[PDB]
Amino acid sequence: MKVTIIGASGRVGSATALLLAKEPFMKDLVLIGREHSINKLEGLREDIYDALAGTRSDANIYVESDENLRIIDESDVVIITSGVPRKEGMSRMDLAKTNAKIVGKYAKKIAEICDTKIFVITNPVDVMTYKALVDSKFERNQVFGLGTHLDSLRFKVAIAKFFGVHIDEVRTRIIGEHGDSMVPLLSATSIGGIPIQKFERFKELPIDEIIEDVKTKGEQIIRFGPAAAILNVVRCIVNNEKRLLTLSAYVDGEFDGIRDVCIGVPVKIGRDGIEEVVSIELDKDEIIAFRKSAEIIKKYCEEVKNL
Amino acid sequence: MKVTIIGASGRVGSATALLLAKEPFMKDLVLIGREHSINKLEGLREDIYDALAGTRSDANIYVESDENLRIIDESDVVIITSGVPRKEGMSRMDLAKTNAKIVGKYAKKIAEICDTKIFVITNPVDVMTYKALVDSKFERNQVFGLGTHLDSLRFKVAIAKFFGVHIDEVRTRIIGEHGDSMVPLLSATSIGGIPIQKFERFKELPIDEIIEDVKTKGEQIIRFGPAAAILNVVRCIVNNEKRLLTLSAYVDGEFDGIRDVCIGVPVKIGRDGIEEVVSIELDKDEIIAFRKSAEIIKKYCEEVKNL
Ligand SMILES: NC(=O)c1ccc[n+]([C@@H]2O[C@H](COP(=O)([O-])OP(=O)(O)OC[C@@H]3O[C@@H](n4cnc5c(N)ncnc54)[C@H](OP(=O)(O)O)[C@@H]3O)[C@@H](O)[C@H]2O)c1
């Protein structure tokens, strides 16, 4: 497999690089950064080679600037983590427009070289995925974003802890915006396969407290972080696993009254990327909240669309 | 951990012995058989020691006849696999009474030595678990049987195959008798956490064909067999995992209109054995079928109770 990471010089990009390099299916790993980052990337490559020393890995690591993307040709997946993180003093719209220009430029440049899958990590992820889809002109199954995948895993841990059951027995998910308008799907939450609604303890679940925790600490490491979540999706693709993850994907009516937007939703993932957006009936409160979330995201998409 | 297997000279007993010996938590493994089986058991112990050669395992393997069970003292769990298998030409009642005398004698002899947990594998498992509970006079959380645990795993594989999703995304179970009166719990079957009823494909699920397969091939190896299923439960106990498996356990009203019988049911398993029988509302057809199944089992229990 060949993977390119644009934004490898950053925190999440460098962590992801280290994890991917250790994978048996990894053949060619391309690390892209701006010209002023080459020295740092060369340092990262040496660190990776040291970590791989002793093993029989035959993976090649490349370091290149973003001036000429010829090197990304034939990549199975291109991960974009370039972008300015949560600014201490700025609005989400300024963040959206600022990163829209970064992700959009890379999406357009990638498409000039080859057809491939784009995995967007830069925030606001749902909006950046949409912008990447628009500027690349790729098919809807080829562009997606981390979305609420890690948020849903965090929620899983919280529920398992509350019921006192093994983590494996809990399957849940959060859809919508990877932000304050996320929607926990209690109608699609099972414990040992049993609907969570069928437990008397469900009545005492601190849903509000738990969600508050996911909204503010959702991108933090779980005592497993963003890097591990990204590897999870990459493995699902190269191994054609067919899992029903929750990622930022393009929707066009799968959920009545929701179209022309990218937003966290259940999808079946495989070697062909988003092989399908799984549409199911939601409960009254969930659909209302989901529409609300989609409306918030649609506004940002409309504002960065032409940038 | 210390485990005793009574019936280790048999097919499932010997396979289980081999698997358990390789576990890191295994300290003392006791193999019990009738006097005429000692040579075969000594041969099995040599085979196990050969398999363990090269590793740094510090497990001790003991071979003893069933004349003096002093050796089982302090066992964390005693697995009983002794019994006559499905006779080519005989009724289930004859099988029940015949094995009732075997399992019951061992349950009584074990209780004379120490208090411990008894894991019953001999068929009819639901009836043999009940007989072991009655003759040992142990608490209801200390005696249980494999039940429909492996049947439920087989059902899981069939459903995952039909929907074309990763095995991990499917959680289901079958309750009732480990026999022809088993009851698949579609109301407690989720795909990616989503109720199976919410999929359009659910309408075309060959439930009848699949169940027929589980009823006749349920004890066969899955391309994972009985031995692996037993290790699964043992690991759940020693590691206090808190999984919601489906085992043969004593029920006393957890499911309205069902008591004084051992039958496959959802239970939370931990270091203390059956820490609780999970009672939940079943759909109309499931409860009717479950009561039917319990009535069939109750008849056998009443007939072997005093043996
Ligand atoms: N969804 C999630 O779970 C999640 C988690 C963590 C982070 N993120 C997001 O992903 C992005 C990166 O996070 P981070 O913590 O890794 O930040 P960061 O490490 O401090 O830096 C990211 C890095 O951003 C690139 N960059 C910055 N401005 C650029 C520009 N104008 N043009 C091209 N590249 C530019 C950098 O390139 P140079 O070094 O070349 O300047 C560098 O690769 C952020 O938008 C953040 O919100 C999302």
Ligand SMILES: NC(=O)c1ccc[n+]([C@@H]2O[C@H](COP(=O)([O-])OP(=O)(O)OC[C@@H]3O[C@@H](n4cnc5c(N)ncnc54)[C@H](OP(=O)(O)O)[C@@H]3O)[C@@H](O)[C@H]2O)c1
């Ligand atoms: N629930 C499941 O998934 C499952 C799967 C497989 C088997 N089983 C059940 O477990 C039992 C064993 O199966 P199997 O295939 O292992 O049969 P088997 O191998 O051919 O023999 C079992 C062995 O049974 C013992 N035994 C037989 N008659 C005995 C008696 N009168 N007193 C004491 N021990 C006696 C044997 O002792 P000696 O060698 O000392 O004579 C020996 O340990 C059967 O009842 C079978 O139905 C259940």
